[PDB]
């Protein structure tokens, strides 16, 4: 019995770029001085993502695991925790992006003969960021799947790192299932002219996914069911499209079919590839999570458009993110959200957005679920009204003086390590920050006196049908919120 049981683990973002394209730690020294910085603060880890294409860059299964060990050893030497991503897209490629990594040209080549990898809008343009869930049991790459690629590159991620995981360094692991490895479609693409609040559009137009879906309807007894031509574009907003609109076709029997389809292939694509980490890093004590996409612009619509664009059909009368969590169960898998420093007043009230209520939602489902949620904040914030935010959300129903909180997320990631972040003033509000978020005590080495013990990874649980997981579906009321946490940074 102690207020330490209120203390939630805070980790820091690198800066992209640590290690970079040609597989070099160009910046041991001043990386150092940054983490040591951090240590300053109290801060329990940080979180860097283990892109793919620098890694098995050379060719299929020709890895170079160098560099990371070099940064691992630093973080390691600096007293931290490290939360790894194992990210197999894209980084960068826009315009103004200093951080630019492809994923593994042998991959991109392969694409050049098949650009149906890709996922693909209707009008026909192929996204080069990650390979299309469509092919993710397809044996096209030089034999393998595009699956086997993901569990390959973890089972080598393991066995390279076999040290830091058995030292308890590498505390995390976080798949990355898609763009910006987050679960979902790369719906709101910046360099196809998307812009904030567009309604975004669909991807699923790939050979791959367009020969499923046609199976699909033709199963369903509806054979001349087509992909939607009514949607719209990027930029448009809800109203303006017949798929959208009230008594739009997204109410049409056709339609839910379609977003029903759409948002399943998500939930399968997570559970597959879920299998094979669990395979990967079995026995190790380390826990695996996930990423999901804070789509907040629309949620205060009927329509729900950005998020079922981006492959989450979730509406005020059918939850698409319980479902996740559920499938995140078997796993034993933390559901790592966002936004959790935005509030509704921020945004723009042409874009309906409801961040604060996603929030809600996203973690009430997964404490229903029984399983663990973690998030970051969505867009670098440096004041008390951002932390104080997230500190609410962490806590929402505030402290439990000698015990527990009721509610409680698992820990949180602070958004980019930067030269702003840990500028004087700034860095003086961000240590009040992890003082609440650690409920007043002081930084605290060993997980396990607030209940964060790391045990062997099991094995998954049984497979779950898709109809059990369909119904989380169903909604619920969220766990009631506090107006603002009780354990506010003083500013």
């Known amino acids: ?36 910085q951090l240590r300053a603060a109290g801060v329990d880890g940080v979180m860097v993502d283990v892109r793919w294409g620098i890694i098995e860059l050379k060719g299929p299964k ?41 994923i593994p040209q042998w991959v ?55 040290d830091f995981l058995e030292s308890g360094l590498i505390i995390d692991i976080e798949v990355g299932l898609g763009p910006a490895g987050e679960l979902r479609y790369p719906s709101y693409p910046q360099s196809q002219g998307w812009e904030f609040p567009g ?16 199976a699909a309807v033709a199963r369903a007894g509806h054979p001349e069911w087509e992909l939607p031509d009514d949607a719209g574009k990027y ?24 977003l029903t389809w759409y948002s399943n292939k998500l939930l399968n694509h997570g559970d597959q590839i879920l299998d094979e980490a669990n395979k990967a890093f079995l026995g190790c004590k380390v826990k695996l999570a996930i990423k999901v996409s804070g789509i907040h612009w629309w949620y205060k619509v009927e329509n729900h458009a950005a998020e079922l664009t981006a492959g989450y059909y979730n509406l005020n009368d059918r939850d698409g993110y319980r479902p996740i969590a559920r499938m995140l169960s078997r796993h034993h898998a933390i559901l790592n959200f966002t936004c959790l420093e935005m509030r509704d007043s921020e945004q723009p009230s042409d874009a309906k957005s409801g961040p604060q209520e996603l929030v809600q939602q996203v973690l ?4 229903r679920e029984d399983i663990r949620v973690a998030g970051e904040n969505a867009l670098p914030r440096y004041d008390a009204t951002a932390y104080n935010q997230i500190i609410l959300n962490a806590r929402p129903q505030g402290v439990n003086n000698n015990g527990p909180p009721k509610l409680s997320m698992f820990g949180v990631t602070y958004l980019r390590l930067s030269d702003d972040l840990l500028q004087k003033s700034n860095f003086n509000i961000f240590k009040k920050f992890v003082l609440k978020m650690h409920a007043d005590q002081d930084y605290c080495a060993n997980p396990q006196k607030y209940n964060h013990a790391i045990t062997p990874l099991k094995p998954s649980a ?30």
């Open 199 to 214: 309604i975004g559009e669909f991807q699923c137009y790939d050979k791959y996914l367009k020969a499923d879906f046609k």
């Open 235 to 258: 930029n448009d907003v809800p109203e303006s499209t017949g798929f959208f609109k009230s008594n739009g076709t997204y109410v049409t029997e056709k339609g839910k079919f379609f």
């Open 108 to 162: 991109l080549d392969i694409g050049e003969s098949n650009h149906d990898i890709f996922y693909t809008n209707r009008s026909g343009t192929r996204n080069k960021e990650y390979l299309t869930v469509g092919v993710d049991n397809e044996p096209i790459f030089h034999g393998r799947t595009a699956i086997e690629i993901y569990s390959d590159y973890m089972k080598s991620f393991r066995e390279n790192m076999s």
């Open 462 to 491: 049984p497979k779950i049908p898709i109809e059990v997981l369909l119904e989380a579906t169903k909604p619920t009321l969220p766990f009631p919120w506090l107006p603002e946490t009780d354990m506010k940074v003083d500013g």
């Open 1 to 36: 019995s102690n207020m330490l049981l209120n203390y939630v683990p805070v980790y820091v973002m690198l800066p992209l770029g640590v290690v970079n394209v040609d597989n070099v730690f160009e910046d041991p020294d001043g990386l150092k001085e940054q983490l040591l």
């Open 62 to 102: 020709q890895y170079d695991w160098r560099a990371y060990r070099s940064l691992f050893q630093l973080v390691q030497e600096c007293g931290l925790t490290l939360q790894a991503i194992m990210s197999f897209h894209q980084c960068g490629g826009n315009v103004g992006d200093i951080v630019n990594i492809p």
């Open 364 to 367: 009430s489902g997964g404490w």
